[PDB]
Each structure stands twice: as C-alpha cells, then as structure tokens.
Design a protein around this nucleic acid. Sequence first.
RNA 1: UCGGGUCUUGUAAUUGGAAUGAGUACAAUUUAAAUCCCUUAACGAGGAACAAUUGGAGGGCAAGUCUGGUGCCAGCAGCCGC
RNA 2: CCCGUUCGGCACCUUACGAUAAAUCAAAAUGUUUGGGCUCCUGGGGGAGUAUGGUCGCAAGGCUGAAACUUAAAGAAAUUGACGGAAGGGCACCACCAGGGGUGGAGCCUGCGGCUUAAUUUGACCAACACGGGGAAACUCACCAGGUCCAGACACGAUGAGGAUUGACAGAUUGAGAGCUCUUUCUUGAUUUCGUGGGUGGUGGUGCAUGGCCGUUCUUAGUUGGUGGAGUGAUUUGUCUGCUUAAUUGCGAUAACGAACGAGACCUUAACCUGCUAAAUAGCCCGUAUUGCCUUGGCAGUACGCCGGCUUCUUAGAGGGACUAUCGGCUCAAGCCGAUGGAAGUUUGAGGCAAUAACAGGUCUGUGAUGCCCUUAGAUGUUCUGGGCCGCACGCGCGCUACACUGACAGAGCCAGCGAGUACUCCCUUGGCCGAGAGGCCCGGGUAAUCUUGUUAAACUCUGUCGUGCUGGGGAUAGAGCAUUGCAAUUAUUGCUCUUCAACGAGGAAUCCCUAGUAAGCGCAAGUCAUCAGCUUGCGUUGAUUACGUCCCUGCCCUUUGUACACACC
Lengths: 92, 74, 71
Amino acid sequence: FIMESGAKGCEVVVSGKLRAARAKSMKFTDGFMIHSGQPAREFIDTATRHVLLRQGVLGIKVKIMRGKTLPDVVTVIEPKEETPVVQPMSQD
Amino acid sequence: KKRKKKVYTTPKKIKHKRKKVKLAVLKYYKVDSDGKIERLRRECPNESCGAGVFMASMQDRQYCGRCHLTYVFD
Amino acid sequence: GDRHPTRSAPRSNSEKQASQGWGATEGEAELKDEQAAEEIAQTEKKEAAEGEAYLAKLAEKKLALEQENAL
RNA sequence: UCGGGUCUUGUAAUUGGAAUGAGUACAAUUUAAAUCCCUUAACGAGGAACAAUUGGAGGGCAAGUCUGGUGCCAGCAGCCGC
RNA sequence: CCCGUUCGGCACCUUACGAUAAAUCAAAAUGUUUGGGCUCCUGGGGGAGUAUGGUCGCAAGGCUGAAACUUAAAGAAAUUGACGGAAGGGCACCACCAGGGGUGGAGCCUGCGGCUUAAUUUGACCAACACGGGGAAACUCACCAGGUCCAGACACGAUGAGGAUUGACAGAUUGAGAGCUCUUUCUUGAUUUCGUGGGUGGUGGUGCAUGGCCGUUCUUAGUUGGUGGAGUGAUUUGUCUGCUUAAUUGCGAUAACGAACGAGACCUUAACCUGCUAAAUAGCCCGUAUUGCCUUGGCAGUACGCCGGCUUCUUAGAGGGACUAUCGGCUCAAGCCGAUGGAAGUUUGAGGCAAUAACAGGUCUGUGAUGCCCUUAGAUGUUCUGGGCCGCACGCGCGCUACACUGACAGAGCCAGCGAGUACUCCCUUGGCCGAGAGGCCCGGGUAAUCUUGUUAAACUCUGUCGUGCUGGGGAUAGAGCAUUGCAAUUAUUGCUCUUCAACGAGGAAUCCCUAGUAAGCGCAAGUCAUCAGCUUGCGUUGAUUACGUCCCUGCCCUUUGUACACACC
C-alpha cells in the first residue's frame, strides 16, 4: 500500500514472540533503500512502536524512503542538433 | 540469597483502643431545678477558643484540648 | 554449554500452532492472503482519496449576591 | 439518483388452496382352512407430530484461521501427527 | 631403422545419434515402437548365515538352511551449509621483522577471588576485573539490629450520631518530645472501622519467556534481482587464470550482458585568500593632553576620539583553490616511484554514519516498556536511628611515585589552548583591610568576545648551594597542634604547622602499545562534586630512533578437498 501511494522504497520489520517458546522475526522488502550517509539520514522516515498482547510484547519497526538529488547520480544534458551550411552568406 | 526465617520476639504491639464512653456530656452540667443553669469546670485563656472549653483538673496540672495550656496550679 | 541442555521447562513450542499465530507456510494460503491484501488496500486508499479532495458565566462569580440579616 | 415494468429464486413475515397412504376397518376375493397382497364402505396432517440415522470437519479426502473446559494429564489418531 | 595396408590381443583420448536416478558407459547401446540362444542369483530393515536335521573333515570348520518375535524406515547418487588435528593463496604494528617507551621487581591508590563477620547487598569470568558513568560519612542502599505509617481503590453485609470514626497535656516508657505503648479525660464527626470479594506496589525470581538498546563476528570486503547459457531437478555461470589498489577499487581473459546494496560519493572539523561583505563586546594608523631619558627632530608608556581613515593580524558568511598538475625511467593497460612548482601531492590530516545474517552475548538494578511466579499490614510497600559494602595470613588486573649529576636544592627571567559561571539562590570572583600558613572581614563586577582571564599553568632559561656516600635522591609508617566543607569527620574527608625518614641501585620465566607534530615528558579545563582525582572525556608545550616490508609465530577470509553432521563437533 505504501508504494501504491507513490513511494520509492520501503521496508517493514517485525519481531518478538507471541505463540511460541522462542522469538521469531520477519523482514519484508521491496524497491530501493540507502543506508550509509547523510542522504540516508534525511530521505528516510522511521518509527518504532510497542504492542502488548495476552502472552507478551511485540516490537514493530517501519522505514519509508521518499523520492534535492542524491550526490552520486550524474545527469548529462542531451546535445542540441545543428546543421551545416554553405560558407558564404550575407545580411542587412 | 534466600529468605531467612524471622522471629519477632516481642509478642505483639496493640494500639490504644478507645474505652467506651456512653454520653458523658450530660455529666457536664448542673441544672438549678427549672431555673438558671450554672456551669461546672471553668474556662481557660481562649484567644482562639471560648465555647465548651473544659480543663483537665486531675492533680495539680491541667491542659486545654486545643490550646494545650500547661498550667501548674498546685 | 549454553545450547544443548535446555535449563527451562518445555512449554508448548508447537510450530503447528505458531503457523496459525504467525503465517501458514503454504503457497495456497498466500494467494488468499494477497487477495485479502488487495481488498484491504483499496478501502484505506479511498478514504484518503475522498478526504484529500443561556448565559450563566457571570453567576459563577455572582455568589456573594445572597445576603443575610445584619448582626 | 431513495424511480417504473417485464423472468427466476429464497424469506426466525402474514395468510390462501387442493391430495394422499403409514395406520385403522364394514364387505367380497385369496387359501386344504387361514394370513399377507390386489380391490373398497366408515375413520386417519398443522407442530412439543405420524418428529431419520450412521460417521466426520489439519493432509491423503468434501466440509469452521467459531465458543466454553483441560493443561505432555485425560485422551485422539489405519499413516504423517495433535 | 622409416612409410603404409591387414588379421588377432592388453589399453587410452574427444563426442553423444543412444542409455541411466545420477556418478558415468563403444557398452552399462540397438527396450512402453517391449521376444537371437542357454545357465545361476535377489524380493523392506533386523532376528540370521543363528537353531534343528543331513552330509564331508583328525580338528578348526565347509555345503545345504528355517521359524517365533520386532520395526517405519534402513539404503543409493548428487546440491547448499557447518566442521576438520587437510592443502594452496591473500590481509593486519589488537601479527612479526628494525626499534622506542613500558608492566611482571618495591611502596601506595583502586577492582576481583578467597577468608572472616549479625550483615560485610549485588551484576559480569579476546568480547569480565579505574566497568554498572559505582570517587557509598547519613541519603544513594537493594544488607543487618530495631521503631512508625497506609496512601488496603471500589462493591456487598453490620456496628452508628440515645455518637461509626480523628487528634492530644502531663507522668511513666524507648536512642529518641515517636501519644510506639500504659495511668486519667478533653476535642473533631459520618471521611471512617469489622468481615467478604476485588485491587495497588515492589532495586523480589526468571536476560534460558520478551520489546527496546548495546557489544562481538567486523575496519575486514562482502551480499543480490532481470534477460540469456548448463542440468529432468535441487542448483549453477555471471561473482574469474593474471596484474593493480586500503577495498568484489579497477584493467583484462571470458557463455555471458546490463544493473542494485555495501566501499566510494556524503557530512563535521584543521590548514591557504593583502580578493568580496564586515566589526568600540577586535584591532591598527592618525589627532589631542601628558610622564621619563637622551636631547634630536626621537624612543618607551598613560588617558581620550564613537560620522578621523583602514580591516594586514583576531573573529564568521558567500566563494575560489589540488585534479595527482608538468616532467624523467618501468608498462599492453590500471598503476607505482622520483624530481620541479605550489599553503597543501599517504584517500591532503582526523572523525561521524555504515550492507545480507547470526549469538540462548549483556541488561528485568533506567523506565508508569513488558508475560508468568512470589510477597502483601509480624510487609519483600514507604519511612527514622546506628552500622557495612573500606572488615584481612594470601593469589591476580588497570594506575601513581622513585631508584638520581641527562640529577636534587636556592634565587631570578617568563610563554598557551579547549572550556565554565548567580533566582528564587547563594555561581565565577576582582579590589581594600586582618591574618606566619590554611583562612577571615568590607565595598564591587559579570547571566557574559564586556567581569573572572593576558586564566603570567607546568615544563623551560640564567646565576649559585650541595658532590658517588641508599647522602640534601625517596617519601611509606606515626605523634602533637591549628582551620575549612558539612546536621554530624571516631574507622583520622581534605588543607595547613612541627617532628618521625621504612622498602627501593634499572627488576627472572613471560608479555604490551606504537609509524610524524606521532611515541614519550609536562601540565590545564570539564564530568561526578558542599569537600575529596592517583579516574575518564577533551586542550595545549617540548619533541625524537627505526620501516616504507614479509608470511617465520599468532588471528582472519577465499578457493580446492573429506563427511554416517544439518538442534550442524557443545
């Protein structure tokens, strides 16, 4: 649903224990995600919440990347077309 | 660790239970047979009192219920 | 050694019941899960899509109005 | 557009219609004598009746991520298992 | 001896039109499109080549050969991991070479074990032990000997205003003016008390039930889709022989081509700008008044200017500048080294963040994050008095002072940077006065580039005393006295004054950290803090020997290889 709303990438992680002896964790991912530098500090929005259940406590972690441009990317402007002409000419 | 045994040697501590008093306020008057009603125990200095203030006259030492007027009368 | 000789009481570590607790690990169920995800997704989106586009105060103070006989 | 009509289906909503034997019983028939069957006078359906059961609901195998109880106990399960 | 043809043998290399589950096979082919001829053997795994019978043999034994009973898997080939006391390659001063400075030797500060005590609270055994920001006089504090209070919500039934329920003077009583209790009676009056149910709290247990966070693997270079090729399939190639780089960073060879995380880029900070915008809470020039000397006309200082002029130095904003630039020898290339220029040529120096995936790593003593169990009124709730965590025959770890002449002692000369500071509180403190010293009194400035502060720090430099002797090097142990912080200093808080003058001559077997403004020496500020630093986090001063490497030791990762393991050598 995140990417239907137009997101460049997302990642949700859930962990804890609810109906088993030991803890279990899952992680689902799609799209792109950066992790290292200050671009990762600002582009990503994160949040973390607890939830209490009859048997215990579950931890939720959500990250969302919204697509002023990353320093690594480089864009080259298309060359403009021109046509050769005969050497002589005149004007006013 | 572990929780060791405890023996509180003193038997028990029992609070000051109030002895019963069955309307001892009616003793506090002396009515003159369908006339005026003179009073019994006199009053105290009553800078912050003045009504019904009785004085614990027992043995040569007295006090007020609120003012705590310790006076050695002898 | 902290692994092989568990030092707690075995208490209902049933993977079968956990499958119900977490997610069944079968291909057939996932297709139904995807259909349900599609159904839930639309309703949440549409709500966002639709959304996006007798005076007595004086009497409180007035309590000293009532008066009584002098002396 | 809470709109109108044409066909089919169902109604923890109301009624309205005709019919029949399971039983039961005058007669005759059946038969060595009877019984049963096949005909047939007089009776025989509106709910708590004239009231259908045996096995199942994780997979092989068709059909509930119900609700109360128990807590490796009682138990279930041809096999994998709970 | 050479070349060639042919018959019959022991073998081999490439390939699959063919076969098989695959490993592989010129037969293991010509088989679901099934028949050339003939002999022998097996029917899930054990019991079992056992018992009994027969037969051969001097014997050991050979040949033939069952059943009762038990069980849901044993087994073959190949794939991915894990592991190995297997091999080959690479990387690293938590590895070594070349070295510097050290510890382990003594005294002391401080943590751990153990011993002992009424208690000496407790967490942890490279990645625990100067750690829990843990430098505890009470408080902190969870322990011991004692004493108080309920804040035990609400609902139900009863006592009850012909009185539920509260507080108290004095005397006794206890460390205790705790009404804690005991003698007697005044005061307040429906909120309380009794019992039942039901809650609340807890530094109480479980980190082997969890969340969150952190540490380690891991400062290393590693991890994946899409289309295509191989395989019936799990999978595999891409992701590699070689060279290069700090790097799966690149060049290349190639059944692969083009991409995505990580690394790089990114951000903070240190070095350059006589060019821009500047500044009395920063400076210089200039101009007045003025002091001292030479005198000259100057030199060295003081006070003022607020539309006198300026921004080199100090300070912050926008930008520029280094990109390996030019060269000379290697070399396909990527590069490496060396000289010149330049403030800067190791990624210019140093940091921050930091991939897929794990650990029964640590924390319930951070949390009103949290399950279950336990305790609840003689409390494991909270609170007050005293103590202890520091008690000591002895083993171990992080540090401090010294073993002196490259020194000690006495005068004098005299240079920083990072930071911090007072409202309902008591901070940083200048100046004047008293005081041998520690300290004391009286005005005042600063909520701050304005005052403390130029923080005149220490090291260091010049002139002398001492002179090889454990001596004037050394400062452990103790006695006496004087103050400060604090309610309180005994088991001495610390400081000051006089005396007392221990061990220790470069430290065995072992072993650590480190490559340039670095090691090492020396001090300063901040954190905890009323006082206490031998501790940590930062700052500056002086300032070197040795190398520009290798896999010999000790770790780690990649490939080949083996496996009866896959909860994976616990």
